[PDB]
Amino acid sequence: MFMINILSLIIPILLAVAFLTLVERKVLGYMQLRKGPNVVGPYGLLQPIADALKLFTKEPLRPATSSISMFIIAPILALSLALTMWVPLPMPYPLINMNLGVLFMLAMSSLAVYSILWSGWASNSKYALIGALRAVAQTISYEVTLAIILLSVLLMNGSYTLSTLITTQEHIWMIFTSWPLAMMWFISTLAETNRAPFDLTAGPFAMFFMAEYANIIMMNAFTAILFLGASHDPHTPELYTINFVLKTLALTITFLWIRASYPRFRYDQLMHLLWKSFLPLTLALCMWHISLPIMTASIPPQS
Amino acid sequence: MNPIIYTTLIMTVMSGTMLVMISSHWLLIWIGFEMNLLAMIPVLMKNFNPRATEAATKYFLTQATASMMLMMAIIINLLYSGQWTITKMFNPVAMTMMTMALAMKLGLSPFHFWVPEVTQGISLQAGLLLLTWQKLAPLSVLCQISQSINPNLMLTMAMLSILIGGWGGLNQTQLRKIMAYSSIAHMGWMTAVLPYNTTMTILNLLIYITMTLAMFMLLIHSSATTTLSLSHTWNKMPVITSLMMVTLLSMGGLPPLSGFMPKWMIIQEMTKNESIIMPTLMAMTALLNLYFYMRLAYSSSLTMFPSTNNMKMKWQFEHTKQMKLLPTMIVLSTLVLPMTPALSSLN
Amino acid sequence: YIAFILSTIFVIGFVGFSSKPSPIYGGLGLIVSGGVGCGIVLNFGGSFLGLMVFLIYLGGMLVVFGYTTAMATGDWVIYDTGDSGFFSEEAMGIAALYSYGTWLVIVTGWSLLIGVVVIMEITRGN
Amino acid sequence: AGRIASFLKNAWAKEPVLVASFAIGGLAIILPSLSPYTNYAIRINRATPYNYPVPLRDDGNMPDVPSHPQDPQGPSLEWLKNL
Amino acid sequence: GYSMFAVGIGTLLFGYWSMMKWNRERRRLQIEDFEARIALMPLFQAEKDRRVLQMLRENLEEEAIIMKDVPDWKVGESVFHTTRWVTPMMGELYGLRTNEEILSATYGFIWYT
Amino acid sequence: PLVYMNIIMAFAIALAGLLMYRSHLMSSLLCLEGMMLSLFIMSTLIILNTHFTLANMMPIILLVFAACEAALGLSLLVMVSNTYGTDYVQNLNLLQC
Amino acid sequence: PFFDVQKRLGLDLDRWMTIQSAEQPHKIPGRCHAFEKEWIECAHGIGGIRAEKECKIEFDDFVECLLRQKTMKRLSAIKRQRDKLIKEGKYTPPPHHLGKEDPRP
Amino acid sequence: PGIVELPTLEDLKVQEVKVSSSVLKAAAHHYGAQCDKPNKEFMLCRWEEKDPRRCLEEGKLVNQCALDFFRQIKRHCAEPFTEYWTCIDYSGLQLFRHCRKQQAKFDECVLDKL
Amino acid sequence: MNIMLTLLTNVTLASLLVLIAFWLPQLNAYSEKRLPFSMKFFLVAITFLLFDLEIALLLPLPWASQTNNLKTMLTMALFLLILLAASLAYEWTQKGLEW
Amino acid sequence: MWFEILPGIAVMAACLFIPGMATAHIHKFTNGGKEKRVAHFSYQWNLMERDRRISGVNRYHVTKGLENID
Numbered sequence A: 001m002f003m004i005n006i007l008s009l010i011i012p013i014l015l016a017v018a019f020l021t022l023v024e025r026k027v028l029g030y031m032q033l034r035k036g037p038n039v040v041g042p043y044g045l046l047q048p049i050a051d052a053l054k055l056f057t058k059e060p061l062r063p064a065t066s067s068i069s070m071f072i073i074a075p076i077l078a079l080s081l082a083l084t085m086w087v088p089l090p091m092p093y094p095l096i097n098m099n100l101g102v103l104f105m106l107a108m109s110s111l112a113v114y115s116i117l118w119s120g121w122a123s124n125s126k127y128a129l130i131g132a133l134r135a136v137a138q139t140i141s142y143e144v145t146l147a148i149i150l151l152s153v154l155l156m157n158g159s160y161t162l163s164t165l166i167t168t169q170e171h172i173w174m175i176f177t178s179w180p181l182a183m184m185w186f187i188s189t190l191a192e193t194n195r196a197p198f199d200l201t202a203g204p205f206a207m208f209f210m211a212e213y214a215n216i217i218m219m220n221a222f223t224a225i226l227f228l229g230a231s232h233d234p235h236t237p238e239l240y241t242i243n244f245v246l247k248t249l250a251l252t253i254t255f256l257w258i259r260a261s262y263p264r265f266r267y268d269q270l271m272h273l274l275w276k277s278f279l280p281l282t283l284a285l286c287m288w289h290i291s292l293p294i295m296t297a298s299i300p301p302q303s
Numbered sequence B: 001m002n003p004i005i006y007t008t009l010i011m012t013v014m015s016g017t018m019l020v021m022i023s024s025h026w027l028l029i030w031i032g033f034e035m036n037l038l039a040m041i042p043v044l045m046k047n048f049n050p051r052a053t054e055a056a057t058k059y060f061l062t063q064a065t066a067s068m069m070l071m072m073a074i075i076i077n078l079l080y081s082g083q084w085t086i087t088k089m090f091n092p093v094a095m096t097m098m099t100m101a102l103a104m105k106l107g108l109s110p111f112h113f114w115v116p117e118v119t120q121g122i123s124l125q126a127g128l129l130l131l132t133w134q135k136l137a138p139l140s141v142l143c144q145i146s147q148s149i150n151p152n153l154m155l156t157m158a159m160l161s162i163l164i165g166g167w168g169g170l171n172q173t174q175l176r177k178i179m180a181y182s183s184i185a186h187m188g189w190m191t192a193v194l195p196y197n198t199t200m201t202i203l204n205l206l207i208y209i210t211m212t213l214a215m216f217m218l219l220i221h222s223s224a225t226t227t228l229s230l231s232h233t234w235n236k237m238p239v240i241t242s243l244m245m246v247t248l249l250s251m252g253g254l255p256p257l258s259g260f261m262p263k264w265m266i267i268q269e270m271t272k273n274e275s276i277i278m279p280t281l282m283a284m285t286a287l288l289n290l291y292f293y294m295r296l297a298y299s300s301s302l303t304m305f306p307s308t309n310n311m312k313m314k315w316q317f318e319h320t321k322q323m324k325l326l327p328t329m330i331v332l333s334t335l336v337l338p339m340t341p342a343l344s345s346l347n
Numbered sequence C: 001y002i003a004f005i006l007s008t009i010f011v012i013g014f015v016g017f018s019s020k021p022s023p024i025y026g027g028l029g030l031i032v033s034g035g036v037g038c039g040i041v042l043n044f045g046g047s048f049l050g051l052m053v054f055l056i057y058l059g060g061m062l063v064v065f066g067y068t069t070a071m072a073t074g075d076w077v078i079y080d081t082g083d084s085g086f087f088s089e090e091a092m093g094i095a096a097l098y099s100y101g102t103w104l105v106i107v108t109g110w111s112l113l114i115g116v117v118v119i120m121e122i123t124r125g126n
Numbered sequence D: 001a002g003r004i005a006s007f008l009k010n011a012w013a014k015e016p017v018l019v020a021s022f023a024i025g026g027l028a029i030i031l032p033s034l035s036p037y038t039n040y041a042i043r044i045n046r047a048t049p050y051n052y053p054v055p056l057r058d059d060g061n062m063p064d065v066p067s068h069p070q071d072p073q074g075p076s077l078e079w080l081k082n083l
Numbered sequence E: 001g002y003s004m005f006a007v008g009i010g011t012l013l014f015g016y017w018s019m020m021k022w023n024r025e026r027r028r029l030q031i032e033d034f035e036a037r038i039a040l041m042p043l044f045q046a047e048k049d050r051r052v053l054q055m056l057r058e059n060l061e062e063e064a065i066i067m068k069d070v071p072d073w074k075v076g077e078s079v080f081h082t083t084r085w086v087t088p089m090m091g092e093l094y095g096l097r098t099n100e101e102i103l104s105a106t107y108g109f110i111w112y113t
Numbered sequence F: 001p002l003v004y005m006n007i008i009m010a011f012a013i014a015l016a017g018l019l020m021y022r023s024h025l026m027s028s029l030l031c032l033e034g035m036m037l038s039l040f041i042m043s044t045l046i047i048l049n050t051h052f053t054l055a056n057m058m059p060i061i062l063l064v065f066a067a068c069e070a071a072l073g074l075s076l077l078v079m080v081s082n083t084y085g086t087d088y089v090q091n092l093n094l095l096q097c
Numbered sequence G: 001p002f003f004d005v006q007k008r009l010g011l012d013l014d015r016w017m018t019i020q021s022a023e024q025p026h027k028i029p030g031r032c033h034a035f036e037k038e039w040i041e042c043a044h045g046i047g048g049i050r051a052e053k054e055c056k057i058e059f060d061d062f063v064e065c066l067l068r069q070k071t072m073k074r075l076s077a078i079k080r081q082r083d084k085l086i087k088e089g090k091y092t093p094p095p096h097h098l099g100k101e102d103p104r105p
Numbered sequence H: 001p002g003i004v005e006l007p008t009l010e011d012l013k014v015q016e017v018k019v020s021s022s023v024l025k026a027a028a029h030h031y032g033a034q035c036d037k038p039n040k041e042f043m044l045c046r047w048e049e050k051d052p053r054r055c056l057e058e059g060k061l062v063n064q065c066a067l068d069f070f071r072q073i074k075r076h077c078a079e080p081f082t083e084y085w086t087c088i089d090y091s092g093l094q095l096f097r098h099c100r101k102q103q104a105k106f107d108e109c110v111l112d113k114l
Numbered sequence I: 001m002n003i004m005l006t007l008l009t010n011v012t013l014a015s016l017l018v019l020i021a022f023w024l025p026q027l028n029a030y031s032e033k034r035l036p037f038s039m040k041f042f043l044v045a046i047t048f049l050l051f052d053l054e055i056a057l058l059l060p061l062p063w064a065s066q067t068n069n070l071k072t073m074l075t076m077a078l079f080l081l082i083l084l085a086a087s088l089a090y091e092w093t094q095k096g097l098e099w
Numbered sequence J: 001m002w003f004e005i006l007p008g009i010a011v012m013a014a015c016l017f018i019p020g021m022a023t024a025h026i027h028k029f030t031n032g033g034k035e036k037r038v039a040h041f042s043y044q045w046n047l048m049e050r051d052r053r054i055s056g057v058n059r060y061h062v063t064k065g066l067e068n069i070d
């Protein structure tokens, strides 16, 4: 029943990102003293269905002069990576139990920029190419600090295994052990997904949008597992699943709140932010988190 | 560039060479070659112009290909024997690959094509460094694995280098290309004796380095890069031209000068191994190098070429910076033949 | 012969990008070849080294290559018999870099710092 | 001492991120050499048995080597439990 | 200003203390698990040796049956000059068995997730 | 065996492609990187097969140095383009033998 | 050429990584530890020429352990003969080699 | 060169210990405490001879010692042991720390019996 | 083989969904009617590459902490991080992080 | 009012409930009512292989207790 497990992982993610659009519109409306969609469906519950049907029934505007190869390749890679990032996640058991799960997520995340590069190159426009280049530069810049923060945090875990993070946070959350790294990790996840205040940029467009929102939910779930560890009882995993889902939802709503609250950066401003505030602090905290377990004789077990 | 950065880069070049020279692990030798190549590129490009950039990219491509094949030879040697120590090569295919990679690193024929262009593109100081210091590491590696070289391939490449240097030097009016072809011929002479005696290789390398340093410093002092520009030096400093003429006579292998010591010794060593035809051809071919050295001497000091009026102003000024060790280099490159038996110091 | 199949594909991708057509397409061919090679290493048992290929090589170096381009115009027998205990030997050997390979760390760090300096000096221009 | 204090006060304003970075880095460099628990961490690493303990052939000249695990001879881990 | 930094340092120290205690307990638990493995190891070694010897003997009997008519063959000849025992390779134990168990013994651990 | 042969064959193909030089110096850099990837795969397979634990650092080291070289090469390429407007190999003919 | 700075100073800059049988972490042995140890002990202090001439047995055994060419050749011969016999129709596999056996712990 | 000597299939016959990994893990500590002598003889022989064929008798001895240990456990402390190893068998990691309670019972029982 | 099947399923579903998206609206009848090369972006990419190499060096730290040579390992890890910080400082001071 | 956002969020929650729970149940269904055995480090892989050989039905999760020791 491995195919059933794979499908039961894939389909609910797609439905969740389908209804996250309605949740985002409703939350933004209510924070804007108005209402979100409440006409199509009893409370807007049919709105995602309507948008999906309209998008799938509308004419696709092929450039008629661009390279069809990369044009069709880019959304495939985007959605495939977005769906693949979910398989090692423990909630509380992963679909695929990996020794180096965290490194696997990092590698796929590094892959994710190829869709941006190829869609920009195949758009057959100089301005879209410039926008794609700017997006790629921002993404690689922030994934550097993502990697360093991730290794610093895992220094208290003992391995790259994602399930061990449940054992590490059995009594206390990792947020209490390292909140500054958590703050920079949250901001770097915001800048990785091109979310406000970093949003500086019909069918294929729907696929790209679906991949983006799946990446948002996946990043929030990874953050919840990494920093707010839920207690897991081996004889009732539903409790862990409920806690993990609630924390993921809270983090996603925080993303929407941040989008609704702030102006957006300039390009040079976010590049300066990273390279001159996050990188020095991240390096200093990486030194601190290397030295701390040795100083206090609190090295984690596995090797 | 900034003098601090320039000093750091030069020290990095020397440290890469020394890492090659002191390590017993193949990976560390490869790392030393990589460090040397990385630090060498800015030194060539120090004076920014399209010619220097072109020379730097040519040199980079050549050295990167050579280093890639060196890594391949190391991996094949490890595959056929779980060894990392630099010793006997344990495999003929790996040893052929290593020999070819080191030959392209040195610029031996038929991998000689990059040397004249790189030397012409870069300035005289970069050319001095490239033609003197950049030969130590590959030659040291070749000396360490001399007992495994196939003598046929080594001797073929050495004889080809001597012939190519002699023939290519005849056609040159640019002094840097003349130096490059001379370097190719001297590399051929150095590598023709590796299978029989590495002490002879080291002695030839020392004599060649002394002579090349002296000639490059003389060319820097009289800031000339062409034959006609060098033909004006007698009207400002005839002493420099006379010293350069004696140095050129030494570089041609004429006794009783210093440049006769290597060939003589090498010939003797080859004769001790029942090799007669090859040293004969080698001396016959070195006659060509001597011919174009003599042509330079004719145009430089033995005759007086026409001058220009604006030379008179140059009569009123003296060189502000004097290169130390230039007199010592001239003396060592001209008058050390009576001290030949000192080679037993295993120089 | 799963390993053999991967090897054949690896060579086919190399022939594809070695013809050097349209450097963007040569880069795509090299990306496919690198993926197949990482798969070979993973199927052999080198999980960390294969993931290192997949992360460093593919996501940094080929990404920078594509960025720069966009700016411009038989088996199973030779295997072991026993087990590795309660750890993975590849991870232990790789982690021995900080306890055994002090010299390697020193020379590599110096080379990387020199590389940063060299890149800045070369791209300065003037 | 006045110039250094003035520099620190001027850096704490208009540049707090760099001050925090240098402070944390320096503390991470300095503290491990002064802590007494680094020896405890080394000892804990030593006491983790990854390999099988191969027994030694008894010749009647090894009183420090126990003949059974429960024998009082050999290293103890009471200190680790008390930690 | 001061109070915010004090609160942050306080929560950092509390987390450090809690993690120190928990990690020391985890080290003790890992030592206990390793000791259980060490206690179980000799029986596993004996069983492994018996199984390897049985497989080698079965392969030897089958080789004797198959290579009877080959003129220059010698049954159970070594490829080494030394008489020291050599640990067999995977192809030596499963060379004559079915593909399913060959692929099991080769890729089961690698493919298990 | 066969697997080793394929890896070597890939290295030889990449070296031949580098030495072909149709145009587009970027293709030369890509050939160099393919050669290094082949070397990485081959060395990793050898080191893992023989259980040479301490040699497990060796692939990583190689990779790092190679990528550094790659960066260097890229910089050179860019400068050449900034002089000619293209990375064409035939434009590097100012210096001749 | 080679300047043995390590031997002069007793530094051990890179000698720890030169052979399989040299102090691996956690005492993890190489696959061919015994053959390499025997070959090294045979060839020690004798020189490359005499080592190549006189320690050929140990080096041959070490190479056989490393690449297993003779073993694969023998296995291939046995498998080919079995395939020919089963194609002809005189030999049949036992239940042990057909998956019908009784496994042991 | 030479013929590889292998023992006959009769030399490799012994009454196997037919319990799974959870049962072995549950009793691993007492098994190590009680069956130390044959196990250490076998391991010393194994590391000294470096030959599987030279250590068969000690292997049969360690199998016999394990069988005797498990027979004593069966005759004395059946049900608490069953609960303990069911505990251990449930977990995907077979952790000792989940149900120490059952362990205590088992320990108490053996301390009263053997 | 489980990861192979999972990747195959993900890629198959992505391809099928994108193909139906691109081909469903193509059955009905409708009308059916440079130079600059910024240096700064190249510098950002190269800095990313070098910093990623240093991250590749720093990656084995979670395993490096169980060696019994804790002082040497700590010294070498701090050396790597200090040289990484020095690279950042050199790029910062020579105006390599400007726009 | 604001609780009108609650329905859609609930739907999202339900979707995010499905994978994890499903995995657990499947793991319990294909591993004999127990947790799926995890095997890193290759020693517990040997334990699982030995369990498979001991069960007699080629299934590792079929546990053989003391009643099988005779």
Ligand SMILES: CCCCCCCCCCCCCCCCC[C@@H](O)O[C@H](CO[C@H](O)CCCCCCCCCCCCCCC)COP(=O)(O)OCC[N+](C)(C)C
Pocket: B202, B203, B206, B207, B210, B332, B333, B336, B339, B340, B341, B342, B343, B345, B346, B347, G001, G002, G003, G004
């Ligand atoms: C033009 C003539 C050449 C001039 C050369 C430059 C002169 C200035 C150099 C100043 C002296 C440098 C010597 C360094 C001091 C100590 C050296 C010592 O530590 O090293 C010894 C080595 O000492 C040197 O080799 C001796 C150098 C003496 C050079 C003189 C020979 C010149 C040939 C004859 C021409 C006459 C020249 C006389 C006027 C200068 C041990 O060597 P070893 O590590 O165990 O083996 C490695 C070398 N192998 C591989 C070849 C065996």
Ligand SMILES: CCCCCCCCCCCCCCCCC[C@@H](O)O[C@H](CO[C@H](O)CCCCCCCCCCCCCCC)COP(=O)(O)OCC[N+](C)(C)C
Pocket: C099, C100, C102, C103, C106, C110, G013, G023, I069, I071, I072, I075, I079
């Ligand atoms: C002797 C001459 C000194 C002056 C000349 C220096 C020449 C250039 C500098 C390069 C020299 C490097 C010196 C260090 C050699 C490494 C070996 C030594 O340090 O021992 C190590 C000890 O480690 C030391 O702590 C290393 C500290 C050195 C690093 C700090 C500064 C490095 C700067 C070097 C220059 C690089 C650029 C300069 C940056 C400022 C090994 O530790 P140990 O555990 O016993 O053995 C490991 C094997 N085990 C596992 C079986 C036990």
Ligand SMILES: CCCCCCCC/C=C\CCCCCCCC(=O)O[C@H](COC(=O)CCCCCCC/C=C/CCCCCCCC)COP(=O)(O)OCCN
Pocket: A180, A182, A183, A184, A186, A187, A197, A223, A227, A258, A262, A273, A277, A278, A281, A288, D017, D020, D024, E012
């Ligand atoms: C003895 C023990 C020592 C312990 C060592 C640790 C001590 C800790 C000292 C304080 C560390 C705190 C650092 C936390 C992160 C600091 C980064 C930072 O300050 O960057 C800011 C900027 O950072 C930002 O403002 C980014 C915010 C972007 C808006 C996005 C919304 C963020 C607000 C919502 C709250 C997020 C909560 C995260 C929770 C995460 C939960 C997982 C600097 O920018 P400038 O003001 O322009 O000044 C520099 C230019 N000259």
Ligand SMILES: CCCCCCCC/C=C\CCCCCCCC(=O)O[C@H](COC(=O)CCCCCCC/C=C/CCCCCCCC)COP(=O)(O)OCCN
Pocket: A276, A279, A280, A281, A283, A284, D011, D015, D018, D019, D020, D021, D022, D023, D024, D025, D026, D029, I082, I085, I086, I088, I089, I092, I093
């Ligand atoms: C010795 C420990 C070292 C290891 C820790 C290092 C961790 C990482 C930190 C290094 C990262 C790179 C740092 C690069 C430094 C660049 C400095 C610089 O040039 O910035 C100046 C500005 O900063 C400066 O003025 C220079 C440095 C100022 C001093 C910084 C702190 C110095 C030491 C203070 C802390 C000392 C110890 C703290 C103890 C407190 C008690 C615990 C220019 O900034 P602009 O972007 O141009 O903007 C200016 C226009 N608005």
